[PDB]
Design a protein around this ligand. Structure first.
Ligand code: GTP
Ligand code: GTP
Ligand code: GTP
Ligand code: 5GP
Ligand code: 5GP
Ligand code: 5GP
Lengths: 460, 460, 460
């Protein structure tokens, strides 16, 4: 990283303390920029969903991986649920999305609530796997909450076979009353849906796929118990990437957990964290980790900082850790504190290969949380931390632990009433990162870190 | 009716204008009073549910008929929907109630909403018709809205075979955690539900049953179209009582209807309304009606009175109509304006054999309307009038009719958060009427009308 | 007028003190009722617009006359301004209504404000008298306030020649985007406008026409100055009915004003008022008046009552004055206090031939006042009394009279956000009056006066 002359502050820098200075650019348009990562994760956009049960859901894993990101499944998830989630994601179409299915015998109450689990705005009514109707929120307004789906469902809708050019599907939905195209298999069964916005994103985002052309998905594991046995079970379940996650990564028990998983030679990239120092980055890479996750108490007013005073401003943490990992041929993930697309752009300019986002994506339709409304009828969803699931471990001991255990904090994540889907946030994030590369003059992410000139600003 | 000396006002009297003067009494308790009625309806309490779609529902018809009342199904209801309702009510137990049934695959969302369809406070989980668990609102609090009923269900409950002593099923629920007892058939199937309070009301209220021991139920017909074919079809569905209902009963089109239905000879009591005059009362009785329903614009600031000025104070209307109907051997029903149990007591003291209650029963769990909550989270249900379904009967023709047609007014009926069931209102209404007979000195309703001394009061 | 037995109160009755008892009826529908008046006014509905400058406007005169009513122009209006208003009403189509006309050069500011002067919801754009497009509220939303009409006008609209069957115009507007049909003259010029709902009122209301088939219109005149030449000028200006109006009609100066106008032999019905006594009714008709207008401080808390104590309840005043005028071969007008259709029915049942309504019609689009909005953005228009223009009359003398002069009170009249038109109030009033005739059993207004049976009620 190269700073303006004189910008050598006597303190570490957060995402608010820095700014990017424009440089001479030949990149004309934002779509000429290549946002694909080079850390072996397979993501075509530098966005990784955090391994938190409030964010890393099954619907999130399919939706983010189709647009180029990847979702790390939260640790301590039962291996049976992991296999069912991987099998679902690995069986999704790379263009056609999974709609919400309804039976004619379902209630209008359930039909209205299930609609908000996807950003499509319409649910497909099915009978023996074949579409027979559509249900929108306008069809449920003012109707008996225990009327059947057959009482409000639209009988006519746009159908198209799977494999049709999204360009043609985009024109089919031009004058359709419902902006949903029900994609069918040759035998007439339901294969999914595709909207006008969904057809545009197919031509902008490249899905993150494995060697077999299936959507990518990652899984996390704690350093408690048999790390090698849990890691091998996640690899055989179909995981494309493994995250060895703990609160304090610069720990002896973490170094042993990396050497245990790395010695098994599972043929998968190993992410380990978290640390915020150059020494902790090299010790994790030499232990057998390919990627180092950076982020320990990034907020000066958050739980970790207010309880222990331990932490480090994230931008200065990524700068030091990415430079240390570059000398060993490793990579760095910027984890924590991402609130706006400039946080993603500044993390990449600091030297990170990917950006891990958690609580921000909780306020979306695709997050595993239930959609809630406040007194002002504003849509929101709750986000919460993993707490003990990232820390190291008689009935006397059970409450001896809870006496000092970290409390689970809960926050309200408001949804945008016009763009409540996670793909809308992906549009917002990638739009800013692409413009940053244009301001710097970079055609790809490696050039962004190469050609960027940073500066420090005061509180004003 | 006997009034105090000098109480000859130059105006008609509402329920607010009059009071009952206590007399010498030997009736000890309320239970000595016989609230049975003598109008041929078979009601052991003088409570009739009005023929309004906002109140006269299926769950309403079953609940109050067990406690001695009768529900008049709203007119113009399709004969198939009637047939499904009568065959339902006629097939219920005279003590054991119908619970809220849940499948193990139902969602918590539907389970939480289905609970308020009854006053039991708990739902029965069934598999192949056998009770296997219970679901209360405490079991759904804080649970995922789309979790399964298998994830929350209490596996243990109180079991008693159908036909068990209503006093005994009380004893088992003494220290039970949930105040519900699931009754089972001899082969183990779900027979129904009985709570503690349901055991007392089984020993206080006598079920209103026909010759076959099945719960009573009535139906309404409109004077439009062919009344003969409609009224004959309602009794073929299993109706025990028919009412020829219209806004202005003292008209020629009305008189011709009863003379048509009375000549059909179905052997069922015919009720007709409305009139608020002795002339209109006698003309309806001689037309073939056994009971006359009284009530034309009882409120001084309601739709009929403020649009047309036509109406009459309900108390003075029932007094005149009851005296004229008794001379011809007919009886009188007091319809509309009932808000407190003293309105029922004063209508009986005026000479009516039954009291038709409507919007007051809309704010109950058993009403067909959905349970709604305002901004203060207080339960309420909306009531609305029949409008054109009580008046005399091509988009151009539909526009001429709707231009002058009566608007469908809607009002908010709040539920008691502690006593939200319709049986609680039955306990509230009957307790005051029984206490009214004790003050007068009557052992039954025919004695109440003959022994009561009335008086007039001012606004203070 | 017949009252119930015993209903002989020791006080006079307002519209709130009385109610109508329904009797035997053979009138099936409301449409079988003939609302025609028999006082020689020519109105097919018993609705007369008061002679107040806040309601008796040009647009009100045309809109009410087409639906069967008549509008009395306020006194002291310049005779030149009267002739231009009378000629406008006399030159109007008896079915097709006058829309809002816009020049292509008009601003969006003026077009947006001119839309609310009629109840059509759209304005016609004309060039040299021929319609070319429509302007609605949605056309002006979010548009530059000083753009031209040529920037927002919808070029296509529904066209039908003048004289077309109104039911076909109703059918053509079935699925039209704007509920507006532009009627064209043979040469293509703008003949006027006709809406859907307006096509139905053409087949329900009969226009009040004069001997030449033109819309009727009345005018008022004070008793100050030359009552003869003013009444002679108003008659020669085209007035179909004259009103000699004053605050206290039972005075000598009023009788001399009737004798002066009667000696002219203008051949027009003469209305005189106001009085509330039979003696005042006898003296007015014997002076030469054909109709007596009754109303002196009808409200117990209005300006006249609280300042002077002079007044009389309107119902008892109309009953006494109608019976007195009936024996002299005249009729009576109920003036003041009209707030609901109940007041119109009770006034007619009392014996009145027409009901005069004032401040109620001020809260309409057709009233001459400007449409205003309060802090809640709710539509309203202000009403005010004639004050000095209804009483008996240097700058020092002007202030000597102003020291005791009646102040001009101002009240807020709210528009119905869904029924801001005066025709909607006419639909609301006539719907209730027609229902009153069905309850009583009358086929027209003369039968209503005899067949009605009144009763007295208390405050409850
Ligand atoms: N009928 C119907 N039920 C659905 C649908 N999607 C989810 N559900 C039900 O909702 C519950 C779980 O919903 P999801 O949250 O989408 O499922 P999940 O596997 O937990 O996935 P994530 O929360 O995204 O990790 C289960 O009871 C499902 O049966 C749908 O499209 N139709
Ligand atoms: N699973 C389940 N569904 C129910 C239960 N009770 C009612 N429903 C369903 O809820 C819907 C409407 O119920 P109700 O409104 O009580 O039925 P209804 O026949 O209209 O009866 P009323 O409204 O009381 O006249 C129907 O689809 C019923 O099948 C129950 O206990 N369990
Ligand atoms: N361009 C245009 N101007 C209009 C239109 N209607 C009214 N105006 C103008 O606005 C003025 C006031 O309108 P009105 O209040 O309806 O006219 P009025 O003759 O006072 O009639 P009333 O208020 O009904 O007694 C008129 O003198 C015209 O200058 C219209 O349709 N188009
Ligand atoms: N202190 C703390 N950090 C957490 C907890 N759960 C997750 N985290 C960290 O915070 C990150 C998410 O930060 P966010 O993107 O929501 O600002 C996670 O990726 C993880 O590194 C928790 O319970 N406590
Ligand atoms: N005017 C009028 N009366 C109605 C309407 N619907 C029902 N009613 C009458 O009002 C009664 C119910 O009165 P409540 O018990 O709600 O005071 C009904 O039994 C019926 O006689 C309606 O739309 N308009
Ligand atoms: N006291 C009083 N009466 C008025 C005034 N202006 C009009 N009136 C009377 O009130 C009538 C209108 O009554 P409204 O229909 O508004 O209830 C008029 O027809 C007229 O008789 C005024 O300034 N003062």
């Amino acid at each position: 990283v190269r700073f303006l002359d004189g910008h050598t502050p006597a303190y570490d820098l957060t995402y608010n303390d820095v700014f990017v200075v424009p440089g001479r650019s030949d990149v004309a348009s934002r779509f000429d920029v290549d946002l694909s990562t080079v850390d072996g994760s397979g993501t075509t956009i530098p966005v990784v969903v955090a391994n938190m049960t409030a964010v890393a859901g099954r619907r999130m894993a399919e939706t983010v991986a189709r647009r180029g990101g990847i979702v790390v499944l939260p640790q301590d998830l039962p291996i049976t649920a992991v296999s069912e989630t991987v099998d679902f994601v690995k069986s999704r179409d790379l263009v056609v999305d999974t709609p919400v299915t309804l039976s004619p015998e379902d209630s209008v109450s359930d039909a209205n609530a299930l609609l908000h689990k996807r950003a499509h705005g319409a649910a497909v009514v099915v009978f023996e796997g074949r579409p027979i109707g559509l249900v929108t929120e306008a069809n449920c307004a003012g109707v008996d909450r225990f009327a059947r789906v057959r009482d409000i469902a639209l009988s006519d809708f746009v159908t198209a076979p799977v494999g049709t050019d999204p360009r043609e599907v985009f024109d089919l939905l031009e004058h359709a009353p419902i902006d949903v195209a029900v994609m069918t298999a040759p035998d007439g069964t339901l294969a999914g849906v595709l909207t006008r916005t969904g057809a545009i994103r197919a031509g902008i985002y490249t899905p993150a796929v494995d060697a077999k052309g299936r959507l990518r998905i990652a899984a996390a594991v704690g350093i408690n118990g048999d790390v090698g046995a849990k890691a091998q079970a996640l690899a055989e379940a179909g995981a494309d990437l493994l995250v060895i996650d703990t609160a304090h990564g610069h720990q002896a028990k973490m170094l042993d957990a990396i050497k245990a998983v790395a010695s098994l030679d599972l043929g998968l990239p190993l992410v380990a964290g978290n640390v915020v120092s150059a020494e902790g980055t090299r010790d994790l890479i030499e232990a057998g980790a390919s990627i180092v996750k950076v982020g320990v108490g990034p907020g000066a007013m958050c739980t970790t900082r207010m309880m222990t005073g331990v932490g480090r401003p994230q931008f200065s943490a990524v700068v030091e850790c990415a430079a240390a990992a570059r000398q060993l041929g490793g990579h760095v993930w910027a984890d924590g504190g991402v609130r706006h697309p400039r946080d993603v752009a500044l993390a990449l300019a600091a030297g990170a290969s990917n950006v891990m986002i958690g609580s921000w994506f909780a306020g979306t339709y695709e997050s595993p949380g239930d959609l809630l409304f406040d007194r002002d009828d504003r849509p929101y969803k709750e986000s919460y931390g993993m707490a003990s699931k990232r820390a190291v471990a008689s009935s006397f001991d059970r409450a001896r632990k809870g006496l000092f255990e970290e409390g689970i904090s809960t926050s309200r994540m408001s949804l945008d009433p016009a763009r409540g889907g996670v793909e809308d946030l992906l549009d917002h994030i990638t739009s800013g990162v692409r413009s940053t590369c244009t301001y710097v003059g970079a055609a790809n992410l490696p050039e962004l870190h190469e050609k960027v000139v940073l500066g420090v600003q005061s509180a004003a």
